[PDB]
């Protein structure tokens, strides 16, 4: 499903989208 | 770290899901 | 008004919404 | 810290407003 | 073009908008 | 740092572009 490296802000965008209304913690 | 897995390598949804609240 | 704990990204979303065009600083 | 007030406890709008520019 | 100081979250919003689909790294 | 250039001073688009991936 993921076919890209997720660097810098891209990883934060991914977590935002994946986690939805749950929210997330980052980078720890 | 998640930065490592997902920027250096390719990570899966499940790996990302581990960081959700 | 606030009836939820605001953890991880949720606190950043809250500050984004509360502070509007002023912007904000976080976590310090 | 603001993380503490607002994740461990429940914080108010005014407490959040203190972090606006 | 830029006529404002970009402090706190404003700098992150600017980078988000400027960098588009490239994404960005911050603050380093 | 970019924080310095752009909060203390006024920075240009090109200065911001240096931080894009
Ligand atoms: C290091 O800490 C040593 O390890 C032992 C002690 O620490 C343990 C972990 N640290 C803790 O503080 C305790 O955590 C316990 C678990 O809590 C639950 C998870 N939360 C955290 O871990 C909190 C950590 C915290 N912050 C983060 O991780 C979150 C940072 C996320 C930033 C990016 C979010 C961006 C959100 C974007 C929203 C913008 C909306 C735009 C809308 C426009 C839409 C439109 O106009 O249409 C931390 O400080 O580290
Ligand atoms: C520690 O520093 C020691 O203490 C003494 C010295 O430091 C004092 C404080 N630190 C300073 O650097 C000086 O600050 C002075 C006060 O300045 C004003 C406030 N600014 C700061 O404090 C700057 C600190 C800085 N950064 C932050 O705090 C801000 C970080 C915010 C990240 C999260 C923002 C997310 C924004 C999301 C936007 C996404 C848009 C999406 C749109 C899509 C919409 C659609 O498609 O529809 C720092 O580096 O710490
Ligand atoms: C210090 O590190 C010592 O220096 C030597 C070693 O380190 C070198 C640099 N650090 C590295 O880790 C290696 O970097 C190599 C270069 O990699 C490429 C660039 N990436 C990084 O540098 C990664 C650093 C990383 N993270 C960041 O910089 C990025 C943090 C950005 C946070 C803010 C992004 C907010 C995104 C908002 C999206 C919200 C969407 C809302 C949508 C709603 C829309 C609607 O509803 O309509 C790090 O951990 O530092």
Residue numbers in the entry:
A (entry chain B), C (entry chain B), E (entry chain B): 1 to 28
B (entry chain A), D (entry chain A), F (entry chain A): 1 to 21
Reported in the publication:
Elimination plasma half-life of ~20 h in dogs and ~70 h in man is achieved by a strong albumin binding, and by lowering the insulin receptor affinity 500-fold to slow down receptor mediated clearance. The crystal structures of these low-affinity insulin analogues were determined to assess the effect of the substitutions and addition of albumin binders. The crystal structures of OI338 and OI320 shows a conserved insulin structure with small differences compared to the human insulin backbone, with root mean square deviations of 0.37 Å (OI338, 44C(alpha), Cα atoms) and 0.56 Å (OI320, 41 Cα atoms).
Two amino acid substitutions (A14 Tyr→Glu and B25 Phe→His, named OI106) were sufficient to stabilize the insulin molecule, with an optional additional deletion of B27Thr (named OI189) conferring further stability. Deletion of B27 Thr (OI189) leads to additional 3–5-fold improvement. The reduced insulin receptor affinity increases the intravenous (IV) half-life in dogs from 25 min (human insulin), to 24 h (OI338) and 17 h (OI320), respectively. Characterization of pharmacokinetic profiles (after oral dosing in GIPET®I) shows an absolute bioavailability (F) of 3.0% for OI338 (CV 100%, single dose, n = 40) and 3.9% (CV 78%, single dose, n = 63) for OI320, calculated relative to IV dosing. To test the accuracy of the simulations regarding the distribution of OI338 and OI320, the link between dynamic changes in the pharmacokinetic profile and the pharmacodynamic response were studied in healthy and conscious dogs during euglycemic clamp settings after a single oral administration of OI320. OI320 showes a prolonged lag time of 6–8 h between the plasma Cmax and maximal pharmacodynamic effect as quantified by the GIR required to maintain euglycemia. The lag time between Cmax and maximal GIR may be attributed to the delayed appearance of OI320 in the peripheral compartment where muscle and fat tissue are responsible for insulin-stimulated glucose uptake. Healthy and conscious mongrel dogs were pre-treated once daily with OI320 for three days to reach steady state and on the fourth day, OI320 was administered via the portal vein by a 40 min square wave infusion to mimic an oral absorption with up to three times the daily maintenance dose to study the hypoglycaemic response and dynamics of glucose turnover.
